[PDB]
Structure 1
Amino acid sequence: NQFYSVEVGDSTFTVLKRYQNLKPIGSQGIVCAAYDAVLDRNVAIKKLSRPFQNQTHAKRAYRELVLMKCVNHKNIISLLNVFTPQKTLEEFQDVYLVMELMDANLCQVIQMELDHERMSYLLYQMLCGIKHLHSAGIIHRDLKPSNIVVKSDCTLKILDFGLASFMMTPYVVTRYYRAPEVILGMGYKENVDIWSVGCIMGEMVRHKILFPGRDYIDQWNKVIEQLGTPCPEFMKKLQPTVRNYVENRPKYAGLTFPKLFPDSLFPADSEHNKLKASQARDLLSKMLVIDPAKRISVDDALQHPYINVWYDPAEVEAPPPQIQLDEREHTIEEWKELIYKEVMN
């Protein structure tokens, strides 16, 4: 038999025999690190348990399978192998995704102070991964630090492809990085992801979540509290019922960016460091913009002085993926077969 079974906490991992010394590194679902004896390297293994059980799990799993396959960019996680231990459609239950492995979540990097070279390089790569996605027509909308992984040598990759919806999960879905246009459901374009990058970068500097809060109500309060109530221009673009709510909230003038992000948070002992600090804060002030009509584009932000030192036309303008009916609604049974079909290939 090609498979063996091993307990990893309260989950059984049934994986191919090439994969060994599994260690839980996540529970973005159930993930193990493993040594792959065939390729002689370490891999990440994600167990998708009954991905067809509901529409939300099934859409995400199918979208994860399809896109991780036909996307080949250094700043997006690579798929190495896909398998099920079950032998037929009737028996079918679990999918295992085999991805390349890095060293840490972006959560762990946020907890440390970084020099400007590393901070700016990470930010450059996030912008690269996102841009490649946009040119395939993939707008992410859910970039968060737990979806972003890094290696010791400062290399960065994005793990997921974002938003495609009720669920009975014990866990909560994080909202802290979602854009004003998503929170208020007002439509969006490419620069919806720039907001998310601004939240991450600001968290990298402050070492705290910029806009925490239990709900979209609490979350909006936090946004306007720090950045100020947005313009009439912005207001006039809101559905009258959303617009009623936003316009009838307590008003804040908001804080200037020097106030929101003081120099004590940036390395600024030397002159090179002092200049980078002001470049980093400028770019923050252009990403953390509520009105997406005034928020910086992905291309403008790659051309920004803080970022552009890393600019590579091969990394920034890589041939867009080819890629298909991806607003799909299906039953459990239909999803089951689409996924199996894709897994079996």
Structure 2
Amino acid sequence: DNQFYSVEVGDSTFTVLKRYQNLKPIGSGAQGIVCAAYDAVLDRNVAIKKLSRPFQNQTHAKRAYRELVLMKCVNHKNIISLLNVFTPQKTLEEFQDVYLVMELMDANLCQVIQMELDHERMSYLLYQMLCGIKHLHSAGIIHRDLKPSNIVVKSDCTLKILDFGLASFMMTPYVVTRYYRAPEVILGMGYKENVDIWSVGCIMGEMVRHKILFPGRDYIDQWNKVIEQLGTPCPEFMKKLQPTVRNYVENRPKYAGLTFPKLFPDSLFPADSEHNKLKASQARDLLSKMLVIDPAKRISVDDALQHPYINVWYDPAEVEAPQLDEREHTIEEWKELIYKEVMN
């Protein structure tokens, strides 16, 4: 008379509470498998993610624990919130998997980037990313790794950021996507709240150009794509660099960089009406303020929410609302740390 039941999804097995029915695979990754399902108790559709032995290594462990803890430090409609969390295993000894449940979303941002969007939807999406990021910043959480695959949306244009960002080695078959990381993350320097504004601009630019702005096999290639388009950083920016890195970037070919009208031509923006012509100008303006290599001169979250392109959606109720853990542990220690959290 178990509260759970098991289902075969891929070469994987999902053991979930009986309230969740008609599971259907919708996504996978190096941290877990996601399924769509009907929650008969809430009479609502939901997404369920399985973390298989998240304590298996430090990488998986730190992330799972941080996110389990963080999800409690945040309360915002543009940030993921759990509906349920559970484990089919009855004791710590037997503990293996953690199931996370949230509201079923319709698509990720990669899909949205593939489409042509009016200014109303693009700015509304951007406005939401900003409200979420602002909320995280208010809770002392600087993300540093925002990316489209981790952002989901619904048909009504509503948006949720799914993870909490950065805090080593793993043997996963697939690498990490770094195309949206700021210069400061890429060059390992100090950083502030607006490190996330660079990521918002890589996304916004991609929604326009429909192509990853700064691709590359690694940080070497990536940095080359950054300077070839925006140009070599100002001399002062360099003084903020470690002598070694600084040597490397200071000794890199000096690029003039392109103007934003060239980087994002009018052809990419809908110029069939005065309204669309004005909005295109305002969008390019925001891009030029967000894609700024030197964090000292890059617009902040609050000022971006005040930019004309974004400001039309401003709402005090949405812009303002509002434990310590650090070190590393052994597998065993992590297993218990996560179990406790799961059992609350």
Establish whether residue 41 from structure 1 lines up as the match of residue 44 from structure 2: yes
Provide the rounded CA distance (Å) in 2 between the counterparts of 1:35 and 1:95.
19
Match of 2:79, SS?
Answer: coil
Structure 1 stretch 92-101 or stretch 26-35: which is displaced more?
A: 26-35
Shift of 1:194: 0.1
Provide the rounded CA distance (Å) in 1 between the counterparts of 2:236 and 2:102.
45
Provide the rounded CA distance (Å) in 1 between the counterparts of 2:138 and 2:284.
28
Contact (CA 8 Å) 2:25, 2:35: kept in 1 or not? yes
Equivalenced residues, count: 340
Shift of 1:281: 0.2
CA offsets, 1:280-302, max 9 Å, x none?
A: 00000000000000000000000
Provide the rounded CA distance (Å) in 2 between the counterparts of 1:138 and 1:2.
36
Provide the rounded CA distance (Å) in 1 between the counterparts of 2:232 and 2:123.
29
* 2:116 alignment counterpart: 113
Structure 1 stretch 188-197 or stretch 63-72: which is displaced more?
A: 63-72
Provide the rounded CA distance (Å) in 1 between the counterparts of 2:229 and 2:325.
37
Provide the rounded CA distance (Å) in 1 between the counterparts of 2:253 and 2:27.
40
Shift of 1:326: 2.4
Establish whether residue 291 from structure 1 lines up as the match of residue 294 from structure 2: yes
Shift of 1:63: 1.0
Aligned alpha-carbon RMSD (Å): 0.8
Could you state the TM-score of these two structures normalised by the residue count of structure 1? 0.97
Q: How does 1:1-12 map to 2 (within 5 A)?
A: 1-12=2-13
Contact (CA 8 Å) 2:179, 2:215: kept in 1 or not? yes
In the alignment, structure 2 segments of 5+ residues that lack a partner are: none
Shift of 1:307: 0.2
Provide the rounded CA distance (Å) in 2 between the counterparts of 1:29 and 1:139.
24
Shift of 1:66: 1.1
Provide the rounded CA distance (Å) in 1 between the counterparts of 2:105 and 2:177.
23
Provide the rounded CA distance (Å) in 1 between the counterparts of 2:216 and 2:120.
32
Provide the rounded CA distance (Å) in 1 between the counterparts of 2:155 and 2:298.
32
CA offsets, 1:58-82, max 9 Å, x none?
A: 1110111111133110000110000
CA offsets, 1:189-214, max 9 Å, x none?
A: 00000000000000000010001111
Structure 1 stretch 165-174 or stretch 27-36: which is displaced more?
A: 27-36
Shift of 1:236: 1.1
Provide the rounded CA distance (Å) in 1 between the counterparts of 2:64 and 2:149.
17
Match of 1:330, SS?
Answer: coil
CA offsets, 1:252-286, max 9 Å, x none?
A: 10000000000111111100000000000000000
Structure 1 stretch 27-36 or stretch 189-198: which is displaced more?
A: 27-36
Structure 1 stretch 190-199 or stretch 16-25: which is displaced more?
A: 16-25
Provide the rounded CA distance (Å) in 1 between the counterparts of 2:103 and 2:61.
23
Establish whether residue 66 from structure 1 lines up as the match of residue 65 from structure 2: no
Provide the rounded CA distance (Å) in 1 between the counterparts of 2:325 and 2:104.
28
Could you state the TM-score of these two structures normalised by the residue count of structure 2? 0.98
Shift of 1:29: 2.7
Provide the rounded CA distance (Å) in 1 between the counterparts of 2:263 and 2:207.
13
* 1:321 alignment counterpart: none
Provide the rounded CA distance (Å) in 2 between the counterparts of 1:282 and 1:250.
27
Establish whether residue 263 from structure 1 lines up as the match of residue 266 from structure 2: yes
Establish whether residue 151 from structure 1 lines up as the match of residue 154 from structure 2: yes
Provide the rounded CA distance (Å) in 2 between the counterparts of 1:31 and 1:227.
38
Provide the rounded CA distance (Å) in 2 between the counterparts of 1:39 and 1:173.
35
Provide the rounded CA distance (Å) in 2 between the counterparts of 1:283 and 1:46.
36
Shift of 1:328: 2.5
Contact (CA 8 Å) 2:153, 2:160: kept in 1 or not? yes
The structure-2 alpha-carbon separation of the partners of 1:242 and 1:118, relative to structure 1 and needing over 3 Å to count, comes to same
CA offsets, 1:203-249, max 9 Å, x none?
A: 00001000111100011000001100000010111110000000111
Match of 1:290, SS?
Answer: coil
Q: 1:240 aligns with which of 209, 218, 243?
A: 243
CA offsets, 1:4-43, max 9 Å, x none?
A: 1111111111111000111111116311111000000011
Match of 1:310, SS?
Answer: coil
Provide the rounded CA distance (Å) in 2 between the counterparts of 1:233 and 1:101.
47
Provide the rounded CA distance (Å) in 1 between the counterparts of 2:327 and 2:316.
35
Provide the rounded CA distance (Å) in 2 between the counterparts of 1:84 and 1:29.
14
Contact (CA 8 Å) 2:58, 2:329: kept in 1 or not? yes
Provide the rounded CA distance (Å) in 2 between the counterparts of 1:29 and 1:275.
44
